[PDB]
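Escalated from tier 1: zinc ion holo job.
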Amino acid sequence: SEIELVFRPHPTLMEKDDSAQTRYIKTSGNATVDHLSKYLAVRLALEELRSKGESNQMNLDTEKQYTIYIATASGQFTVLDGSFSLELVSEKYWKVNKPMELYYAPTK
Amino acid sequence: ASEIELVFRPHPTLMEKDDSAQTRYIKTSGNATVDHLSKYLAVRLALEELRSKGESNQMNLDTEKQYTIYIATASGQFTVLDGSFSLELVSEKYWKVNKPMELYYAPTK
Amino acid sequence: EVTVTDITANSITVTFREAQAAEGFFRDRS
Amino acid sequence: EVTVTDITANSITVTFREAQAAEGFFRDR
Ligand SMILES: [Zn+2]
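Tier 2 regenerated the structure:
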């Protein structure tokens, strides 16, 4: 729907060996951070399953929950409460009239 | 034929009855092997579980067995299908009828 | 719907197409 | 081109759409 997201791995909290591939996402502004974290978990799991499906290995397996961040002034990242709507996040933290930039990392 | 149709169900006695286990209607290539089919089943079951968790109220994704494939032959008994066999070969060797090929699964153990 | 899944084994990838019913999917054998 | 996924939390199901690039996906502003 109406909220647009440019969704990336947290630059520092990544696993170096993992893809840095930016995701472009549309959804309702009423979606919460918890919905987005769960969406990520599901999408990554689905992608991993399909990848294992296409790999030469005969054996599969079963991972993580994610924390969502937004960049703030200055040189830092703010953890977003799971109950926040994405609309609130854009108004409170992002503000500008552009697709919103959010980040993710596995919850320690 | 280069294409093959399968009716794929849990083994009637080696697996406990499960109303949540629907018959699967499948088309694939005759040159696909039994190994492809067993791996497909594990992947499909996992995909379905993931999507079900996605739509449930569960915030934590929990979420894996290996499967053996069987066919009931003319005698009514079951044959365990070698993983290396093509589905084409299975159809010619064990099914031999002009109907979608009925195959079954149960865990390897 | 018809799901489509690609599966690799022994260095060969194949496609499985799956429907929830035979009618409209399987070919007529008459 | 576009991936569609329904995700539920707190008894509200939300639909997510995802693409591989902004152009032709995101709206003009
Ligand atoms: Zn054939």
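Helices of chain A lie at 33-54, 86-94.
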